[PDB]
Design a protein around this ligand. Structure first.
Ligand SMILES: *C(=N)[C@@H]1CCCN1C(=O)[C@@H]1C[C@H](N=[N+]=N)CN1C(=O)CCCc1ccccc1
Length: 710
C-alpha cells in the first residue's frame, strides 16, 4: 500500500537543551522558523506525498459530492435587534462566508448589510468580532485574513450601509465596546513588533493595551486607557454597563475562568475620556471569575465561580463592596453548571444550565432570582441567543447530533409567555429517525464515571464490526455538547460508522472541579479517560481497535497524539487537527503563554516532570511488541495558524517518520497536510471546510479499507 517514500529531513544532532538536569535533544528545532527555505521545502515535500495518498481512491470524490449536497442547506443565526432595526446572519447553503442582513421590522423585506464574500476570491477574509453603537446607528467589525487571529477593525454607518474612513490595526484578542454617548469605542491592540504580523510569524504577544478610538479620527490619536507594563501577560477587556455609566475592565492572565474586575464611573472623569481612567479596583486578584450580567444603580449582578465551582449569581453593591456583604441572587446548584446568563426586558434573567451535558433554559426574576418559566427543549445544546436589557423579546437557537437546528422566538411583553418556532430547516438525505443518540457513563482507571454520547443507526448488532469515530478535547473548561455535523453523519450513513464523543476531564461539563481534574499534575487523567472510552466502545461491541478512529483539535490534537504514543494498540487511525505537540516549548510562541494555566510550564522542575511524560514530541517510541505498530496518523495544520503555531505538527511528523516510519514493521502511513490561506479554523470558508472533511474521511476509508455505502 505504501507507494511513496518519506522525505529526507535533516537532524540537528547538536540541538541539546538541559531541563533541570534532564537532557533533551530537539533535532528538528530548525522547523520552528516558518520563513526559511529549509522549512518551506519540508512542507512542500510533505504535501507532495500526502495529497496523492488522499486523492487516489474514488472514496474522496464520493464523500466530497455527498458533503456538498448534504451541507447545502440554509443556515441562519438568531435575529437580534439593534436600535430600530433587526439583524441576522444567513448562508443560502454553500456560500464561503455567512452574510449579515438587515430589516426594518420582523415582517419587513431584508437586505444585505455586510457580505464578507465580496472581500476575497476564495472566502479567506472573514468577520471576527463586531459591535454596534448603543443606538444601533453605527457598526464596528473586525476582519481577519487567511484565518489569522490578527484583526483589522473597520466602521460603517448603518443607514445606507456607508463605509467610513476609520481603520484600526494591530488588534488581536480584543474587546469592542462603544460608549453610550456614541463618541467612540474601546478596543485592544498590541505594540509594534519586529518582523511580520500576518499570522505566519511565531512571535509571542505581550503588553496588550486598552485604547479608546474617537469616531472620525486617525488611530494615532487614540487614547490609552489602561496598560500593565509590569505584567506583560495581562489582558484588559472593556465593556459598558447596560446604563452606560460604568466601564468594566475584566483583566485576564492565562486561560483559567478567573479575572480581576475594575470599574470606572464615567461621570467621575474630570473631562471625558482623556487618558488613563480613574479605575476603582473592586476585585484585584485572580481568585475568581466575575462576568457582568446587569446592574441597577450601584448593585451589580455577576455570574461567578468564587467558592462555587458549578457557578452562581451574586450581587455586589459598589457602595458596600466587601465580600461578606454580597447577596447570593441565584445559588449554586449541586451538580448542574450555570453556563451563561443574560438580562432581558429590564427585569428578567435568562439562565442556561448544563445538566449531564445537555442544555436547559430558564427565565428568572432579576429582583429575587426566582424561577419564572422553563423554556422546553429537546436533548441537545443552545448555541445562539439574543436579548439585551432594553429589548423585549428573545431568540435562541437549538442544535443536536441529528437535527440541524431550530430558532425559537419569545415575545416577553406578553403576560403568558409562548415560545414559538421562528426558523427550522431539515436536511433531506439524512433521515434522523433512522438513528439514535445514547448517553452512557463509563468508569475511568480511577473509577470516575465519564459521560459519553454514542450516535448510531438503530438496530445494529454489537459484534465489534463497525468503524467508529471517537472525538474528545479535555481541557480549558470547554464542554463538548451535542452539535449538528453533516460530515460525521455521512460517516454514519455512507461509511456504516458509529460516532462517539467522550466528555473527559479537563472540560467544563461538571464545572471547575471537572476542569481541575484534567489539568497540571492531573493532565494524565484526560488521556486515561479517553483511552477508557475507546476500551468501552470495544468491550461493548460497537467497534474493534483496527476499525477505531480517534479525532481531536488543538488541545484535542494533543489528546489524540498522546493517546497514539501511549496505546498504539487501541486505535486503527488517528486524525490530529492543529495540535499542541511540543509541550516543552508551547509557551514561547504567539499566545501559547496563556495555556500554562492548564498545562504548567517547562521552566519549573515540577511542571517539566509532568510534561515530559506525555509531550507528544518527546514520547515517540517504537512499540516493543512485534505485532504492534503505530496507528495510521494524519496531522492537519495550516500556514497562518497563529493560535497553535504549525511548527508543532512539523516537528512531530518529522519525529514520527524518522523513529517509527523507518521501522520495517510500520506499514500504516504517518502524514501531514499543511493548508495555505488558512489558520486555526475560525472563519475557514465553506470550500475549505468541505475539502478538509473529505481529506479526513478519505484517509479513514483508505487506511481501514472501508467500502462506501451509497
Ligand atoms: C487549542 N485548544 C489551543 C491550544 C491549547 C489551548 N488553545 C486555545 O485556543 C485556548 C483554549 C480556548 N480555545 N478553545 N476552544 C481559548 N484559547 C486561547 O488560546 C485564547 C487566546 C486568547 C485569550 C488568552 C487569554 C485569556 C483570554 C483570551
Amino acid at each position: 500500500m505504501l507507494s511513496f517514500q518519506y522525505p529526507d529531513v535533516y537532524r540537528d544532532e547538536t540541538a541539546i537543551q538541559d531541563y533541570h538536569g534532564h537532557k533533551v535533544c530537539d533535532p528538528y528545532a530548525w522547523l520552528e522558523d516558518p520563513d526559511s527555505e529549509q522549512t518551506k521545502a519540508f512542507v512542500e515535500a510533505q504535501n507532495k506525498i500526502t495529497v496523492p495518498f488522499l486523492e487516489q481512491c474514488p472514496i474522496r470524490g464520493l464523500y466530497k459530492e455527498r458533503m456538498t449536497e448534504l451541507y447545502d442547506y440554509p443556515k441562519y443565526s438568531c435575529h437580534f435587534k439593534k436600535g430600530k432595526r433587526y439583524f441576522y446572519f444567513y448562508n443560502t447553503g454553500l456560500q464561503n462566508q455567512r452574510v449579515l442582513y438587515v430589516q426594518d421590522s420582523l415582517e419587513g423585506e431584508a437586505r444585505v448589510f455586510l457580505d464578507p464574500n465580496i472581500l476575497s476570491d476564495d472566502g479567506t477574509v472573514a468577520l471576527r468580532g463586531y459591535a454596534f453603537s448603543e443606538d444601533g446607528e453605527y457598526f464596528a467589525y473586525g476582519l481577519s485574513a487567511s484565518g489569522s487571529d490578527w484583526v483589522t477593525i473597520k466602521f460603517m454607518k448603518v443607514d445606507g450601509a456607508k463605509e467610513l474612513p476609520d481603520v484600526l490595526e494591530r488588534v488581536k484578542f480584543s474587546c469592542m465596546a462603544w460608549t453610550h454617548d456614541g463618541k467612540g469605542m474601546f478596543y485592544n491592540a498590541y505594540p509594534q513588533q519586529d518582523g511580520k504580523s500576518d499570522g505566519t510569524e511565531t512571535s509571542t504577544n505581550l503588553h496588550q493595551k486598552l485604547y479608546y478610538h474617537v469616531l472620525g479620527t486617525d488611530q494615532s490619536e487614540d487614547i490609552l486607557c489602561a496598560e500593565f507594563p509590569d505584567e506583560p501577560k495581562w489582558m484588559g477587556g472593556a465593556e459598558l454597563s447596560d446604563d452606560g455609566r460604568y466601564v468594566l475592565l475584566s483583566i485576564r492572565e492565562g486561560c483559567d475562568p478567573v479575572n480581576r474586575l475594575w470599574y470606572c464611573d464615567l461621570q467621575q472623569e474630570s473631562n471625558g475620556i482623556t487618558g488613563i481612567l480613574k479605575w476603582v479596583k473592586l476585585i484585584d486578584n485572580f481568585e475568581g471569575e466575575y462576568d457582568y450580567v446587569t446592574n441597577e444603580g450601584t448593585v451589580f449582578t455577576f455570574k461567578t465561580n468564587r467558592h462555587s465551582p458549578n457557578y452562581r449569581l451574586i450581587n455586589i453593591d459598589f457602595t458596600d463592596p466587601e465580600e461578606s456583604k454580597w447577596k447570593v441572587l441565584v445559588p449554586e446548584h449541586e451538580k448542574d453548571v450555570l453556563e451563561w446568563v443574560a438580562c432581558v426586558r429590564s427585569n428578567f434573567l435568562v439562565l442556561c444550565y448544563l445538566h449531564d451535558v445537555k442544555n436547559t433554559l430558564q427565565l428568572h426574576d432579576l429582583a429575587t432570582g426566582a424561577l419564572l418559566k422553563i423554556f422546553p427543549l429537546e436533548v441537545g445544546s443552545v448555541v445562539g441567543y439574543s436579548g439585551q436589557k432594553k429589548d423585549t423579546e428573545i431568540f435562541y437557537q437549538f442544535t443536536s447530533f441529528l437535527s440541524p437546528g431550530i430558532i425559537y422566538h419569545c415575545d416577553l411583553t406578553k403576560e403568558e409567555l409562548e415560545p414559538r418556532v421562528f426558523r427550522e430547516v431539515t436536511v433531506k438525505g439524512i433521515d434522523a429517525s433512522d438513528y439514535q443518540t445514547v448517553q452512557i457513563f463509563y468508569p475511568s482507571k480511577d473509577g470516575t464515571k465519564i459521560p459519553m454520547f454514542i450516535v448510531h443507526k438503530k438496530g445494529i448488532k454489537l459484534d465489534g464490526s463497525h468503524p467508529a469515530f471517537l472525538y474528545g478535547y479535555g481541557g480549558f473548561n470547554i464542554s463538548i455538547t451535542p452539535n449538528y455535523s453533516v460530515s460525521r453523519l455521512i460517516f454514519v450513513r455512507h461509511m456504516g460508522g458509529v460516532l462517539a464523543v467522550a466528555n473527559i476531564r479537563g472540560g467544563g461539563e461538571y464545572g471547575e472541579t471537572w476542569h481541575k481534574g484534567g489539568i497540571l499534575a492531573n493532565k494524565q487523567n484526560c488521556f486515561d479517560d479517553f483511552q477508557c472510552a475507546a476500551e468501552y466502545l470495544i468491550k461493548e461491541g460497537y467497534t474493534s481497535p483496527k476499525r477505531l478512529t480517534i479525532n481531536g483539535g488543538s488541545n484535542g490534537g494533543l489528546l489524540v497524539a498522546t493517546c497514539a504514543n501511549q496505546r498504539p494498540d487501541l486505535f486503527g487511525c488517528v486524525i490530529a487537527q492543529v495540535g499542541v505537540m511540543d509541550m516543552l516549548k508551547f509557551h514561547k510562541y504567539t499566545i501559547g503563554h496563556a495555556w500554562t494555566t492548564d498545562y504548567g510550564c517547562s521552566d519549573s522542575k515540577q511542571h517539566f516532570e509532568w510534561l515530559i511524560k506525555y509531550s507528544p514530541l518527546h514520547n515517540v517510541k517504537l512499540p516493543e511488541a512485534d505485532d504492534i505498530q503505530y496507528p495510521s496518523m494524519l496531522l492537519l495544520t495550516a500556514d497562518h495558524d497563529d493560535r497553535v503555531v504549525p511548527l508543532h505538527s512539523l516537528k512531530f511528523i518529522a519525529t514520527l517518520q524518522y523513529i517509527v516510519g523507518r521501522s520495517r514493521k510500520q506499514n500504516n502511513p504517518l502524514l501531514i497536510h499543511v493548508d495555505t490561506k488558512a489558520g486555526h479554523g475560525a472563519g475557514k470558508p465553506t470550500a475549505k471546510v468541505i475539502e478538509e472533511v473529505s481529506d479526513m474521511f478519505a484517509f479513514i476509508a483508505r487506511c481501514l479499507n472501508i467500502d462506501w455505502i451509497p
